[PDB]
Design a protein. Sequence first.
Lengths: 93, 93, 83
Amino acid sequence: VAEKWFDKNVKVLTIALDGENWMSFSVNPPLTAYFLDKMIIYLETLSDNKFIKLSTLREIYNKVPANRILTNIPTNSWLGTFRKWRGEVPQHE
Amino acid sequence: VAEKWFDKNVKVLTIALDGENWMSFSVNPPLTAYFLDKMIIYLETLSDNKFIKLSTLREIYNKVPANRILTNIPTNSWLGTFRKWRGEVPQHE
Amino acid sequence: IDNTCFLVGDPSSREQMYFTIVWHHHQAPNYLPDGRIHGPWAYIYVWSDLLKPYGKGPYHYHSVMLNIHPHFKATYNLSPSLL
């Protein structure tokens, strides 16, 4: 996360993922809870040094207006295909 | 098999199937060999009484000529679909 | 032994980047038309011994970390079907 600070074009950094599948589908799920605690401790040291401004998405929405205008976004999921729900099982059609 | 003999339209009777899979994928494969022996015993009884003429496909081809004429037979398999080798696995295409 | 590198920089060089994370908490509506529950994942991920000895379940663990760390902000998606 800190190596993104050196890049000056990185204005807003966003991470989005399932909040509970990663702590339950790992090999040893309890260690993933220790991971979260140590991680949140580490990211709190990047906000007291003022490297990052830890905030919520609603706060970023008000603080940073959206200036550039996109005109079209093609239809897609975050897996690059819709064949996961229509096509990857023989009895989908 | 003898029930087809009462019908007068049954001139040639044909049975076609895989030779070894019916007898090696059954629940109790050894008894399927008993079945074949008994069935061959019974079929010979229908041939000595001159009910049927148990023969080969050359003999039927030469003794019985084809009189009707078919013009079209649509593409198809004996499973009614080609999706078994193209479509029933997602990774076929 | 491994190359555990670290970083040095001047916090005043640039405007600090706005940082946020989105957690997507969701279970499908797993009740039958009668009302009985056929998919128990909204519940066993709240009261199982899955994150033992550090917590009970992912949904409850994420809630207790919000009390443990009162300075850590994050955006959450509590799915309406889960709520």
